[PDB]
Amino acid sequence: GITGTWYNQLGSTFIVTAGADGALTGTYESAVGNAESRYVLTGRYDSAPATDGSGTALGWTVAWKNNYRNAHSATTWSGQYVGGAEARINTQWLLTSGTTEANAWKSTLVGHDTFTKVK
Amino acid sequence: GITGTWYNQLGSTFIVTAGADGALTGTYESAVGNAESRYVLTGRYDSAPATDGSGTALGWTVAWKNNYRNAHSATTWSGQYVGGAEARINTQWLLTSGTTEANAWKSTLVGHDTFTKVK
Amino acid sequence: GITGTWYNQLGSTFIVTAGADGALTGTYESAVGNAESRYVLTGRYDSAPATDGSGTALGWTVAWKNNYRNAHSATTWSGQYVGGAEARINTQWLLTSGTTEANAWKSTLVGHDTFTKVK
Amino acid sequence: GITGTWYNQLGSTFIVTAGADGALTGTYESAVGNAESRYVLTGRYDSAPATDGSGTALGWTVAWKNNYRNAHSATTWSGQYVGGAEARINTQWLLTSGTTEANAWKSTLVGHDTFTKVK
Ligand SMILES: O=C(O)CCCC[C@@H]1SC[C@@H]2NC(=O)N[C@@H]21
Ligand SMILES: O=C(O)CCCC[C@@H]1SC[C@@H]2NC(=O)N[C@@H]21
Ligand SMILES: O=C(O)CCCC[C@@H]1SC[C@@H]2NC(=O)N[C@@H]21
Ligand SMILES: O=C(O)CCCC[C@@H]1SC[C@@H]2NC(=O)N[C@@H]21
């Protein structure tokens, strides 16, 4: 029930398939930034989703490289799937770009994203 | 040259193999926290490493679930491999645990790690 | 126009007064967590608010200590006041608790908050 | 014992005076970035420092504005003073710049700093 075609508040598309062991595959099309295509993602999530009423912890990784453009950067999301009547995924994310060792302090960006299934 | 057996400042072990397309596989044994084994990791990195003199951006994901213990949590690293005479990987990371919707604010932890190849 | 009585999505109250030089004073009552009173905050913001159409960058600090309860912790917000028809303040924040040197990795928590003036 | 003249790993200077109530005043000269002077800081820390053996939680705020240059940005540190034979302050920090509402995702930067008293 974690697989599907999620959107978020910036408008970017996140097509995902969960795995039997805990794998996470799919593509990710950022609607904003230095990117124009679907990009490859990979990540993991636990499969024992703590049935007391909590959300399923998950995380994944995208590196901004394909046939069209490269930004030499990588972004990781970590969040929790809150699954109920409103299927929601709240994530918080990092973005690291490849900089020179002088510009090491300003490499990382942080932010948040709210993923909804049927927009 | 990104593959290998890295340690860090907490003492945890990170066995990694890079990929021809940009995949990243291997295991991760946290020496601290609610974990006792090697755990499965998966992530990505770009393969056009920007030969002006910058580091290679990379990121990966571990979900704390195996045959021994489960913490219902997932952690993601994003950083850059600085490769020279001293092979170094500086990463900054998030840790998300599966909480109830009341305790949504205190789910995520942030921190930093400094990975060295030959300790 | 930054001064006033803001609420947020968790329900916590943030009473603030800006300064002529750039100071920021007021109180902060967290509606959730290990706190029960108004707490003291202090922070800063720039006063040249970049009239091209951007938001005003700001930040502040609260330490969870008063006559009622102490948590030995400190939280800092950094965000930007987007001021228009809908007066909004989006912030992203850190929370650090005083831990032993063994438990240094799990001290910091990260999160986000969305402040609205008239709720 | 928190007051004094701290340096860090980037070379920036942090002159600080603690307060009887819990206030924190002083100046901050960033040795790197879009800044050239001492800048004004303000923040807070708790004064009941948990004498079991933990560090003192603290945090502060700087807004990059003075007579010389303005960057329309604000940075906040949150960390813990580990005080022993080696007086250390480990902090983790955010940096928010005033951007247009389109460029809201890439406003914030995250990073870490390690402050030492006698360098
Ligand atoms: O910044 C870059 O170098 C490329 C653009 C990255 C897009 C970011 S990644 C996190 C955030 N969420 C998105 O869907 N897109 C932005
Ligand atoms: O907190 C948990 O629920 C399990 C322990 C997680 C270990 C964390 S993950 C990030 C940091 N780096 C490590 O090598 N271990 C800790
Ligand atoms: O965790 C603690 O030790 C005390 C509770 C802190 C409340 C946090 S601070 C950030 C977030 N925003 C709020 O208005 N409250 C929570
Ligand atoms: O980026 C800017 O707009 C101005 C430069 C800010 C300097 C940053 S703030 C955090 C980090 N620690 C420092 O001592 N300097 C950098």
Numbering used by the authors:
A (entry chain C), B (entry chain D), C (entry chain A), D (entry chain B): 16 to 134
Manuscript excerpt for this entry:
In this work, we use SPA cryo-EM with VPP and Cs-corrector to determine the structure of SA with a molecular weight of ~52 kDa. Different from hemoglobin that consists mostly of α-helices, SA is constituted by mainly β-strands. Our work demonstrates that the VPP can be used in SPA to resolve SA in both the apo-state and biotin-bound state at near-atomic resolution. The atomic model of SA solved previously by X-ray crystallography (PDB 1MEP28) can fit into the EM densities with a correlation coefficient ~0.74, indicating the structural fidelity of SA in its crystallographic and soluble forms.
In the end, we obtained a reconstruction of apo-SA at 3.3 Å resolution (with D2 symmetry applied during the refinement) from a final dataset composed of ~24,000 particles and a reconstruction of the SA–biotin complex at 3.2 Å resolution (with D2 symmetry applied during the refinement) from a final dataset comprising ~45,000 particles. The density of biotin in the SA–biotin reconstruction can be precisely identified with the unambiguous docking of biotin’s atomic model. Compared with the biotin-bound SA, the density corresponding to loop 46–51 in the EM map of apo-SA was missing, indicating that this lid-like loop is flexible without ligand binding. We performed this 3D skip-alignment classification analysis of the apo-SA and biotin-SA datasets separately, and found a rather small occupancy variance around the biotin-binding pocket among the different classes in each dataset, demonstrating unambiguously the lack of biotin in all the monomers of apo-SA and the full occupancy of biotin in all the monomers of biotin-SA. This result occurs because SA has a very strong binding affinity to biotin and the condition of the biotin-SA specimen allowed the full occupancy of the protein’s ligand-binding sites. We also noticed that the orientation distributions of apo-SA and biotin-SA were slightly different. This difference is probably an effect on the surface property of GWI by 4 mM free biotin molecule in the biotin-SA solution. The 39 kDa trimeric dataset had enough signals to generate a correct 3D reconstruction via a global angular search from scratch. Nevertheless, the successful reconstruction of the trimer dataset indicated the capability of solving an asymmetric protein structure with a molecular weight ~39 kDa at near-atomic resolution by SPA cryo-EM.
